[PDB]
Amino acid sequence: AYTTFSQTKNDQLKEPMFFGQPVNVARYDQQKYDIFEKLIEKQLSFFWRPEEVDVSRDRIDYQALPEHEKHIFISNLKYQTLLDSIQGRSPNVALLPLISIPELETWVETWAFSETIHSRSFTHIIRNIVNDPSVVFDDIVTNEQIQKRAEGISSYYDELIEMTSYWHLLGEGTHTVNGKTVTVSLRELKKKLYLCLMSVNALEAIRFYVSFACSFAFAERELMEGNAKIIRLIARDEALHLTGTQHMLNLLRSGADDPEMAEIAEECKQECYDLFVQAAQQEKDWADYLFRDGSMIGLNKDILCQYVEYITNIRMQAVGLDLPFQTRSNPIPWINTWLV
Amino acid sequence: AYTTFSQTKNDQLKEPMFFGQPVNVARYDQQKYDIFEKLIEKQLSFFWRPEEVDVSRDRIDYQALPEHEKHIFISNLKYQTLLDSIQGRSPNVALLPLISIPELETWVETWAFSETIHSRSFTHIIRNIVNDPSVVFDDIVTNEQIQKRAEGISSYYDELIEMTSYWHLLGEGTHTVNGKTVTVSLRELKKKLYLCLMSVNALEAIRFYVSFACSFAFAERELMEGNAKIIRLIARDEALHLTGTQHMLNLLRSGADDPEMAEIAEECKQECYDLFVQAAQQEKDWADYLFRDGSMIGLNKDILCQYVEYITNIRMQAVGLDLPFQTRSNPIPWINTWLV
Numbered sequence: 008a009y010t011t012f013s014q015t016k017n018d019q020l021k022e023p024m025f026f027g028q029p030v031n032v033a034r035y036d037q038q039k040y041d042i043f044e045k046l047i048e049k050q051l052s053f054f055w056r057p058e059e060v061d062v063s064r065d066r067i068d069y070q071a072l073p074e075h076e077k078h079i080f081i082s083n084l085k086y087q088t089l090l091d092s093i094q095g096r097s098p099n100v101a102l103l104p105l106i107s108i109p110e111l112e113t114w115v116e117t118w119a120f121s122e123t124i125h126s127r128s129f130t131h132i133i134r135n136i137v138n139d140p141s142v143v144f145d146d147i148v149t150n151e152q153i154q155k156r157a158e159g160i161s162s163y164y165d166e167l168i169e170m171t172s173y174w175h176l177l178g179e180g181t182h183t184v185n186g187k188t189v190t191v192s193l194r195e196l197k198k199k200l201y202l203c204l205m206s207v208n209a210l211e212a213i214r215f216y217v218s219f220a221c222s223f224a225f226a227e228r229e230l231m232e233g234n235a236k237i238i239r240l241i242a243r244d245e246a247l248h249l250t251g252t253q254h255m256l257n258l259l260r261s262g263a264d265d266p267e268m269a270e271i272a273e274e275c276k277q278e279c280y281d282l283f284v285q286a287a288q289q290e291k292d293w294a295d296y297l298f299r300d301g302s303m304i305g306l307n308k309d310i311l312c313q314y315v316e317y318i319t320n321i322r323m324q325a326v327g328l329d330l331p332f333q334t335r336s337n338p339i340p341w342i343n344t345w346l347v
Numbered sequence: 348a349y350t351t352f353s354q355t356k357n358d359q360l361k362e363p364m365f366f367g368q369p370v371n372v373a374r375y376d377q378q379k380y381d382i383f384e385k386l387i388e389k390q391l392s393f394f395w396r397p398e399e400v401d402v403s404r405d406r407i408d409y410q411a412l413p414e415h416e417k418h419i420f421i422s423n424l425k426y427q428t429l430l431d432s433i434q435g436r437s438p439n440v441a442l443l444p445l446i447s448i449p450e451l452e453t454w455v456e457t458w459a460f461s462e463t464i465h466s467r468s469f470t471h472i473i474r475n476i477v478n479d480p481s482v483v484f485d486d487i488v489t490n491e492q493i494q495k496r497a498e499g500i501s502s503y504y505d506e507l508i509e510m511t512s513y514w515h516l517l518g519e520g521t522h523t524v525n526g527k528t529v530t531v532s533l534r535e536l537k538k539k540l541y542l543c544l545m546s547v548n549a550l551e552a553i554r555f556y557v558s559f560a561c562s563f564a565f566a567e568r569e570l571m572e573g574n575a576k577i578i579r580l581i582a583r584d585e586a587l588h589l590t591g592t593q594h595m596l597n598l599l600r601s602g603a604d605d606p607e608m609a610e611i612a613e614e615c616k617q618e619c620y621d622l623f624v625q626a627a628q629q630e631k632d633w634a635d636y637l638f639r640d641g642s643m644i645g646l647n648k649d650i651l652c653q654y655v656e657y658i659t660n661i662r663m664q665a666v667g668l669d670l671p672f673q674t675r676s677n678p679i680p681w682i683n684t685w686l687v
């Protein structure tokens with residue numbers, strides 16, 4: 008029951024962000040929530056092309072890095088590649104089929120699009136510093152350390168996607184699928200969406216910021232400056248992406264949108280807290296991996312783990328969760344110089 | 348069956364364009380078909396913001412047009428808005444979940460994103476020329492003439508989406524949903540995709556070009572110059588869009604990708620032809636509607652219908668279908684001034 012053009016005229020201004028009547032005409036003259044249009048406009052004015060970034064001296068710098076430092080850099084780069092590959096497609100397949108307001112529909116499309124520009128910039132980098140790009144790309148899928156986080160993130164999307172299909176196809180209630188009985192609940196589906204958004208918020212707000220830290224640590228040493236320029240542009244986008252999921256979440260839990268969402272948000276508090284905390288933990292185990300056999304000027308396991316906690320506190324707070332860490336200061340204040 | 352990140356490592360250069368293993372690493376260092384990467388690069392270089400085009404002087408132009416000409420202009424603009432609304436979401440919702448080639452997945456997302464820019468540009472025009480934009484937007488949905496031209500296009504996408512859904516949720520073979528035995532044939536799915544792509548190609552290659560004629564007719568009279576400038580930018584994107592679908596269809600039907608497709612291509616060459624001829628006929632009825640109260644300098648039902656036939660032969664031949672109309676030189680050669 009999904010349609011690329013719903014034939015019944017409806018007032019999109021009195022429609023919920025999700026689960027209402029699929030958007031028919033895409034208009035931008037009216038806004039239910041000013042944030043989304045503000046984000047689309049911002050994102051469009053931020054438009055950049057990875058190919059235009061000069062990554063010439065970068066091969067030299069990378070080739071000169073000792074092995075563990077190449078390991079730190081490339082592992083970090085494979086993680087960013089893996090995250091943005093998922094973020095390029097997932098928000099379109101997962102959220103797009105559920106959105107009921109035009110401005111949000113376009114924001115999701117604009118947002119997912121910018122991720123593809125991000126994935127393109129990683130290729131531009133990888134196939135410019137490394138000898139055989141295929142070795143790096145293949146490892147993103149076979150490396151157990153990288154895949155350890157991959158399966159958790161996508162799992163949220165995949166579960167939402169499948170539960171969305173049963174809903175669209177069978178609708179609410181119990182149904183007979185090959186003799187089995189299957190229960191499709193819109194309430195459960197709304198939970199899946201809420202949790203997925205929470206997971207996506209942790210990815211852009213925490214996971215990606217941990218990676219920016221390693222990228223900029225090299226930049227501080229005046230190495231990999233082409234990469235630095237790309238990551239700084241990427242970060243400028245992540246700020247916008249993160250803000251969009253923050254607003255979506257806050258609007259949903261504040262009942263200002265779908266009142267049932269406000270309820271669901273509450274039943275979820277623990278799961279959210281736990282998923283955010285689990286993400287932070289995973290980022291700390293990553294720091295162990297990256298720094299297994301050494302650190303470099305400006306970064307080490309301690310510095311990164313503290314940064315992870317610092318950032319986690321701040322993000323969790325922004326979406327109404329309890330701060331899980333005592334940490335209260337930024338150990339890498341220079342990162343703000345890069346961040347925008 | 349769908350996963351936002353397939354954990355199995357595969358050689359992406361030996362996957363079919365569609366239905367293969369879902370895309371995992373988004374890489375652009377290696378292309379199976381150079382056309383797609385070329386199109387991405389071209390679109391990226393074409394980036395424009397509707398918000399930056401001056402549509403001020405258009406309002407006086409529009410308000411000064413006699414009633415029938417306002418009818419011609421606004422009906423054309425509404426049809427354009429309807430088509431880009433569908434084009435904004437559909438490629439993502441329908442083709443995205445079936446692509447198994449990185450460069451292709453990215454092209455569809457780039458393509459769909461440029462469509463949202465087109466939709467935004469229509470809001471920018473509508474707001475700057477009419478009194479109550481809401482009447483215009485509401486009519487796109489309640490108008491039986493406009494909504495008629497949206498039935499066919501949606502159906503193709505909708506049926507593809509729904510079947511794609513069943514396939515992901517039930518795999519192929521015969522199954523039972525609420526006792527009703529429903530069969531899921533991958534071959535029937537591949538046919539729906541093929542027809543959908545043909546419908547899409549007709550949309551961008553013919554339907555849109557028919558609309559550019561009306562818009563540019565006004566520009567020839569030095570009226571609606573702001574809209575003219577936007578339509579030029581859009582036309583320039585449309586070229587890329589149809590090149591995309593022509594190649595998709597030609598590669599599919601050539602067996603150069605998946606053999607089952609090439610077979611399915613010939614299996615439904617008659618439907619494809621009927622589909623295109625039907626599209627041309629609707630654009631002729633549409634031209635009939637546009638001019639039921641008069642025509643203007645440079646364009647009338649006759650001239651417009653000739654152009655539909657002119658453009659249709661060319662497009663049909665490009666995808667290897669038979670030419671259904673007499674031969675003739677471009678009936679409105681002045682449109683070259685505006686094209687590209």
Ligand SMILES: [Fe+2]
Pocket residue numbers: 416642643644
């Ligand atoms: Fe006239």
